[PDB]
Write a protein that binds this ligand. Structure first.
Ligand SMILES: O=C(O)c1cc(Oc2ccccc2)c(OCC(F)(F)F)nc1C(F)(F)F
Length: 130
């Protein structure tokens, strides 16, 4: 929809702190930090697919809005994820071991803005069309 497309990471703030707050170890944070992924968002019927592709790591999720699904994250957490659309924002929550983190995806001007929150840490990542 407004989200559909092939997006390239152009800026990131506080991603290392965000991964640290999630408990990600040094090697995986290193890989993640200097990744510059593409994010490819598509929709077919009820099903949204978000692929995140980079030289050292790829992930993919497919989901129906409002329906919980299992996910293995890029940092290898096994989580229960639910994604909803709220005022134009795709809101993802991941739940595991009594914790949660939120990842909000929104469209702003030419940007796909990704805000990731874990406890007191807020990370902002910005994608632009490829
Ligand atoms: O889409 C993102 O840019 C993104 C990318 C992530 O990791 C990568 C890095 C390279 C390739 C594919 C995935 C990631 O990992 C979970 C983490 F951060 F906990 F490790 N989380 C996110 C986000 F939080 F924002 F959704």
């Amino acid at each position: 929809d407004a989200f559909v497309g092939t997006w390239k990471l152009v800026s990131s703030e506080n991603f290392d702190d965000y991964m640290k707050e999630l408990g990600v170890g040094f090697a995986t944070r290193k890989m993640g930090g200097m990744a510059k992924p593409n994010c490819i968002i598509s929709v077919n019927g009820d099903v949204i697919t978000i692929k995140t592709e980079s030289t050292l790591k790829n992930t993919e999720i497919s989901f129906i809005l409002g329906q919980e699904f299992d996910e293995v994250t890029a940092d290898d957490r096994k989580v229960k994820s639910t994604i909803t659309l709220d005022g134009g924002v795709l809101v993802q929550v991941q739940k595991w071991d009594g914790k949660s983190t939120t990842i909000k995806r929104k469209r702003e001007d030419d940007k796909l803005v990704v805000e990731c929150v874990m406890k007191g840490v807020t990370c902002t990542r910005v994608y632009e069309r490829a």
